[PDB]
Amino acid sequence: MYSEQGINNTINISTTSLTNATQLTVIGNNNSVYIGNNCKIVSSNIRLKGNNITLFIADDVEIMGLVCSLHSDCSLQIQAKTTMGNGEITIAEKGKISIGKDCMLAHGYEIRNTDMHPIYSLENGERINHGKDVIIGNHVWLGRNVTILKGVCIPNNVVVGSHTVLYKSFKEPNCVIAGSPAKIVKENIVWGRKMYHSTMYDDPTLNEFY
Amino acid sequence: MYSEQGINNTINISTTSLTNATQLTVIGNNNSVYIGNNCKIVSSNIRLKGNNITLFIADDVEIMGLVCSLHSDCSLQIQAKTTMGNGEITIAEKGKISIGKDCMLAHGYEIRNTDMHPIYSLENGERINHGKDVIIGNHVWLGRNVTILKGVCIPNNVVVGSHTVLYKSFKEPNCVIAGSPAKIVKENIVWGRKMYHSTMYDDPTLNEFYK
Amino acid sequence: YSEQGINNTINISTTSLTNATQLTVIGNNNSVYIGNNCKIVSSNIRLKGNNITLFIADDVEIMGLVCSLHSDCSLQIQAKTTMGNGEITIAEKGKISIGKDCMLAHGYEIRNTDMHPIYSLENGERINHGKDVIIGNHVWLGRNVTILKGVCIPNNVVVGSHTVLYKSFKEPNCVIAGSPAKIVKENIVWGRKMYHSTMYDDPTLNEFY
């Protein structure tokens, strides 16, 4: 699975977490990987190339089929209880992506803080697509094949509809966002994981949202 | 071939149909699987877990790489001569999805009567995204990577354009639906399978759609 | 490769890499030219039919292309173009042309054909005949872009990720995105490397100003 080449790399994967069929590659220096405890990080391909990169996955995170590329001085922070299917996260330009607590990311997600190539204005010659941090709030549910691009911030307890592309940030919590261009399509809601909970009151994990 | 667990489960797969490389799993009671004559249901993964589940696939249906998950009291019905490439069909909340005669589904389809997870109103705590049935009419062609969500009904003789997401129903037949949001972009058409034909009149399977 | 039929000509430069690539040619009078210093890896290229042409110029890099060509079709890819994983389909005796120094990100789908007919009820005639696709020089396709029949893209254009193009554009030097597809930013030029504060530091970009 794991493969390192470089100096002063710190890799602590809790011994209670599972990493079956996962590939971890670290090329470079002064990097840190932190996983566990009670994590299931399976069939993924995670790549850190450079210096001073931080990968932080908190307790109780379940990821399956993530392809992840991090360049120098980048950091990926995924908070506890977050679940993630197949997808891709790319970070470059010494930026950050953070994913809050108790998120649910369905298969097909694509998350990035960068276009990986420059676009310049012919008017003044300046670059106009610098990378920008992605912040994904607590208790966010991304439907299938959602794409989250650079600089986008998602509030807490928000649902993003299947196949939506987000180019811009939103400020309102407790809403559903869908369509193209992306927009608030429903307000004043809260989502849960279990359909067998008839009401939000039957879900202990939701107490805080109401 | 298939793995079956439980009581009063019935499985009828015609001996003239091919199921090469397909896994069929049925767990529960009172479930029924039917696959008619001269079908090719290949490289597929089909799961029935629960009670009173129905899977009915008529004659001359060809399916390649279907991933299909059905739960209790759910039913999937696919009528004769329909062809399907790689894709996913998910049915829960005791609902139903039906696919009509002579449909053509290109690789990439995602079809569901359900969101799989509850959305509650903050006003009164009630669930407001209950599952809803899906009905795909006769002679519907789905282009590549089309997504059909809960409650969607598609009229007969319709083409859905590549990468279209349908979140609500349409009523107009004989049209092309595409874009986002999904809308009728062309009217008064009929589609066929074979590019070699000069005109619709040359395709006997299309007689019923223009009279 | 795997070549079967009469008078097929396959010329792949000895300076080019084809690691893990399946090239299958079934039919007659087909021709494949791949130029110098190419890397065509982990791809699956199928020519099924007769009188098909595939021309790939120098310094082209392709990783994970699934390509299907039918009789009398042609695919041309000009020098210095790079392409990730994706799919190209040509039929109805048509052609697709990709210009110089393009950059095609993972998930592209490019086709000159719908593969099945649509007829008008007014007269029974087919209204969706295949139509050539032309991608200009120095075009950058973001992730998961879909290019449908008849589409012509001007030089020096960026196509935003997940965009579907159904219609041609005329304006060079722009960003195209959204649905429907529209010009979302004018008067730009893209580059490959981000270690350049301005466009004047990229020698490759001079011909655009």
Ligand SMILES: CC(C)(COP(=O)(O)OP(=O)(O)OC[C@H]1O[C@@H](n2cnc3c(N)ncnc32)[C@H](O)[C@@H]1OP(=O)(O)O)[C@@H](O)C(=O)NCCC(=O)NCCS
């Ligand atoms: C996000 C989602 C859960 C919200 O569903 P919902 O709360 O029941 O709300 P709806 O989807 O019916 O739509 C709410 C409104 O937005 C509209 N809307 C939905 N999708 C839209 C689209 N893509 N473009 C424009 N409007 C859209 C609806 O028409 C509706 O309008 P209305 O107020 O007039 O009724 C659901 O839309 C969805 O994307 N389902 C897929 C979930 C999924 O991918 N699960 C798989 C594994 S996690």
Ligand SMILES: CC(C)(COP(=O)(O)OP(=O)(O)OC[C@H]1O[C@@H](n2cnc3c(N)ncnc32)[C@H](O)[C@@H]1OP(=O)(O)O)[C@@H](O)C(=O)NCCC(=O)NCCS
């Ligand atoms: C659905 C499809 C077959 C329709 O073909 P068509 O009859 O020639 O349709 P057109 O390209 O002429 O488009 C019809 C109209 O809708 C518009 N349109 C098509 N797709 C659109 C979309 N993505 N968003 C917005 N508008 C769209 C067109 O611009 C056109 O508008 P206009 O007539 O006012 O100029 C074609 O769009 C398509 O999706 N082809 C790919 C099919 C495929 O996946 N094949 C392989 C799997 S079987």
